[PDB]
Design a protein around this motif. Structure first.
Motif, PDB file in Angstrom:
ATOM      1  N   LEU A  12       0.734   4.122 -10.486  1.00 18.68           N
ATOM      2  CA  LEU A  12       1.704   3.705  -9.469  1.00 18.68           C
ATOM      3  C   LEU A  12       1.444   4.387  -8.140  1.00 18.68           C
ATOM      4  O   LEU A  12       1.308   3.725  -7.113  1.00 18.68           O
ATOM      5  N   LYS A  13       1.389   5.716  -8.162  1.00 21.85           N
ATOM      6  CA  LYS A  13       1.143   6.491  -6.945  1.00 21.85           C
ATOM      7  C   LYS A  13      -0.102   5.962  -6.258  1.00 21.85           C
ATOM      8  O   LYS A  13      -0.126   5.830  -5.040  1.00 21.85           O
ATOM      9  N   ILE A  19       0.306   0.969   0.255  1.00 25.73           N
ATOM     10  CA  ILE A  19       1.538   0.465   0.887  1.00 25.73           C
ATOM     11  C   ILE A  19       2.009   1.306   2.072  1.00 25.73           C
ATOM     12  O   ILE A  19       2.177   2.515   1.954  1.00 25.73           O
ATOM     13  N   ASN A  20       2.280   0.648   3.190  1.00 29.36           N
ATOM     14  CA  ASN A  20       2.725   1.328   4.403  1.00 29.36           C
ATOM     15  C   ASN A  20       4.220   1.244   4.673  1.00 29.36           C
ATOM     16  O   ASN A  20       4.740   2.015   5.477  1.00 29.36           O
ATOM     17  N   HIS A  21       4.915   0.309   4.040  1.00 31.66           N
ATOM     18  CA  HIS A  21       6.363   0.225   4.226  1.00 31.66           C
ATOM     19  C   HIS A  21       7.058  -0.475   3.062  1.00 31.66           C
ATOM     20  O   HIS A  21       6.629  -1.535   2.600  1.00 31.66           O
ATOM     21  N   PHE A  22       8.134   0.136   2.586  1.00 29.99           N
ATOM     22  CA  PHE A  22       9.000  -0.520   1.622  1.00 29.99           C
ATOM     23  C   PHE A  22      10.140  -1.230   2.304  1.00 29.99           C
ATOM     24  O   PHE A  22      10.357  -1.061   3.503  1.00 29.99           O
ATOM     25  N   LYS A 170       1.286  -3.780   3.823  1.00 30.06           N
ATOM     26  CA  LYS A 170       0.223  -3.308   2.910  1.00 30.06           C
ATOM     27  C   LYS A 170      -1.015  -2.899   3.729  1.00 30.06           C
ATOM     28  O   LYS A 170      -1.361  -3.550   4.719  1.00 30.06           O
ATOM     29  N   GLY A 171      -1.646  -1.793   3.333  1.00 29.30           N
ATOM     30  CA  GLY A 171      -2.792  -1.249   4.068  1.00 29.30           C
ATOM     31  C   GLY A 171      -3.427   0.022   3.512  1.00 29.30           C
ATOM     32  O   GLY A 171      -3.830   0.078   2.351  1.00 29.30           O
ATOM     33  N   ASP A 172      -3.543   1.031   4.371  1.00 29.23           N
ATOM     34  CA  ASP A 172      -4.264   2.265   4.061  1.00 29.23           C
ATOM     35  C   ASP A 172      -3.332   3.442   4.199  1.00 29.23           C
ATOM     36  O   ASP A 172      -2.502   3.483   5.101  1.00 29.23           O
ATOM     37  N   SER A 173      -3.505   4.412   3.317  1.00 27.55           N
ATOM     38  CA  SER A 173      -2.744   5.648   3.344  1.00 27.55           C
ATOM     39  C   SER A 173      -3.258   6.459   2.187  1.00 27.55           C
ATOM     40  O   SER A 173      -3.967   5.917   1.342  1.00 27.55           O
ATOM     41  N   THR A 174      -2.931   7.744   2.134  1.00 26.14           N
ATOM     42  CA  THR A 174      -2.973   8.434   0.845  1.00 26.14           C
ATOM     43  C   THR A 174      -1.744   9.300   0.643  1.00 26.14           C
ATOM     44  O   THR A 174      -1.043   9.657   1.598  1.00 26.14           O
ATOM     45  N   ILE A 175      -1.482   9.606  -0.624  1.00 22.85           N
ATOM     46  CA  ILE A 175      -0.508  10.603  -0.991  1.00 22.85           C
ATOM     47  C   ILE A 175      -1.193  11.968  -0.840  1.00 22.85           C
ATOM     48  O   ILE A 175      -1.773  12.498  -1.785  1.00 22.85           O
ATOM     49  N   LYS A 188      -6.019  11.653  15.467  1.00 22.26           N
ATOM     50  CA  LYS A 188      -6.727  10.532  14.847  1.00 22.26           C
ATOM     51  C   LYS A 188      -7.418  10.991  13.543  1.00 22.26           C
ATOM     52  O   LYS A 188      -8.009  10.184  12.798  1.00 22.26           O
ATOM     53  N   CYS A 189      -7.326  12.290  13.267  1.00 20.88           N
ATOM     54  CA  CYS A 189      -7.895  12.856  12.070  1.00 20.88           C
ATOM     55  C   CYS A 189      -6.937  13.828  11.441  1.00 20.88           C
ATOM     56  O   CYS A 189      -6.460  14.733  12.116  1.00 20.88           O
ATOM     57  N   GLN A 190      -6.664  13.664  10.151  1.00 23.50           N
ATOM     58  CA  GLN A 190      -5.766  14.583   9.472  1.00 23.50           C
ATOM     59  C   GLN A 190      -6.368  15.074   8.183  1.00 23.50           C
ATOM     60  O   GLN A 190      -7.044  14.322   7.485  1.00 23.50           O
ATOM     61  N   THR A 191      -6.124  16.350   7.902  1.00 19.67           N
ATOM     62  CA  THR A 191      -6.564  17.000   6.675  1.00 19.67           C
ATOM     63  C   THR A 191      -5.433  17.884   6.224  1.00 19.67           C
ATOM     64  O   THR A 191      -4.680  18.376   7.054  1.00 19.67           O
ATOM     65  N   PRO A 192      -5.312  18.112   4.915  1.00 23.41           N
ATOM     66  CA  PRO A 192      -4.204  18.936   4.414  1.00 23.41           C
ATOM     67  C   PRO A 192      -4.039  20.362   4.998  1.00 23.41           C
ATOM     68  O   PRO A 192      -3.009  20.981   4.782  1.00 23.41           O
ATOM     69  N   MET A 193      -5.021  20.879   5.722  1.00 26.22           N
ATOM     70  CA  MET A 193      -4.856  22.180   6.378  1.00 26.22           C
ATOM     71  C   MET A 193      -4.634  22.075   7.896  1.00 26.22           C
ATOM     72  O   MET A 193      -4.320  23.076   8.539  1.00 26.22           O
TER      73      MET A 193
END
Ligand SMILES: *[C@@H]1O[C@H](CO)[C@@H](O[C@@H]2O[C@H](CO)[C@@H](O[C@@H]3O[C@H](CO)[C@@H](O)[C@H](O)[C@@H]3O)[C@H](O)[C@H]2NC(C)=O)[C@H](O)[C@H]1NC(C)=O
Lengths: 193, 48
Positions: A12-13, A19-22, A170-175, A188-193
């Motif tokens: 599911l995740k 998904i970009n919006h519910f 519907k599109g691109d993303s991550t958890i 324009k660039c993201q990383t968990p740190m």
């Protein structure tokens, strides 16, 4: 908060990755519950402002007078979006609580879309005590194509939906798995740190 | 189920060296495909 497990959770995740919006819509009104008691499905395991309370997009049906008549309700996705919809079974701690809550010796759940054939049977058993409780809720999910109906049926141990979820954008993303909170910037660039 | 097979409770038990299966038919209310409601779920195996 009420312990158990989420069946096929990761699958599911991952689907939530695209998904970009519910949009949460109401599929079964809590008010419309017939000859059962939707109001008293609360538990001290899940506290909200000092009182006992429960999850908010489902409802934990309890028996009426001293009976639990077979549930037989359905819903057609006449929207033009794919519909994510979640329900759940309760697993009791004994035969005592079985009658005390749901009424009957033996119970089953039966949801069925155009491509689902589920028949669920709660499992009684002794187990260690998590968050006060030692019964368990095991939840489930499915996606409903447009113009598809989904028909539930159960004579006990059934946690029913009120709200479902429309896949709008519907599109691109991550958890992403970071522990930082927001800092009001834009990149324009993201990383968990 | 009476119409077609008489017995109320029913099963299938396929057995070999490795395989040890026993199937139980799930009755459920579900939407109609090909003028049809009930489903047939198939299985398979390679007998050595
Ligand atoms: C849930 O609601 C949807 C939307 O109303 C239902 O889908 C519609 O069902 C009708 C038949 O009841 C479809 O009409 C059919 O069209 C074919 C070919 O054009 C015709 O030969 C048949 O006699 C029939 O009348 C209609 O197209 C369809 N709507 C769309 C656009 O999908 C549906 O019945 C409900 N869900 C189910 C089947 O559980």
């Amino acid at each position: 908060c009420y312990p158990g497990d989420f069946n096929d959770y990761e699958e599911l995740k991952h689907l939530l990755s695209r998904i970009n919006h519910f949009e949460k819509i109401q599929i079964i009104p809590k008010s419309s519950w017939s000859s059962h008691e939707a109001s008293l499905g609360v538990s001290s395991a899940c506290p909200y402002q000092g009182k006992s309370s429960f999850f908010r997009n489902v409802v934990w049906l309890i028996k009426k007078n001293s009976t639990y008549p077979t549930i037989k309700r359905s819903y057609n996705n006449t929207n033009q979006e794919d519909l994510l919809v979640l329900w759940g079974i309760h697993h009791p701690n004994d035969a005592a609580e079985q009658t005390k809550l749901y009424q009957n010796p033996t119970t089953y759940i039966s949801v069925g879309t155009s491509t689902l054939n589920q028949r669920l049977v709660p499992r009684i058993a002794t187990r260690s005590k998590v968050n006060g409780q030692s019964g368990r809720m095991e939840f489930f999910w499915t996606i409903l194509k447009p113009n598809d109906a989904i028909n539930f049926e159960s004579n006990g141990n059934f946690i029913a939906p009120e709200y479902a979820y429309k896949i709008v954008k519907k599109g691109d993303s991550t958890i992403m798995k970071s522990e930082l909170e927001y800092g009001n910037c834009n990149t324009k660039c993201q990383t968990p740190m």
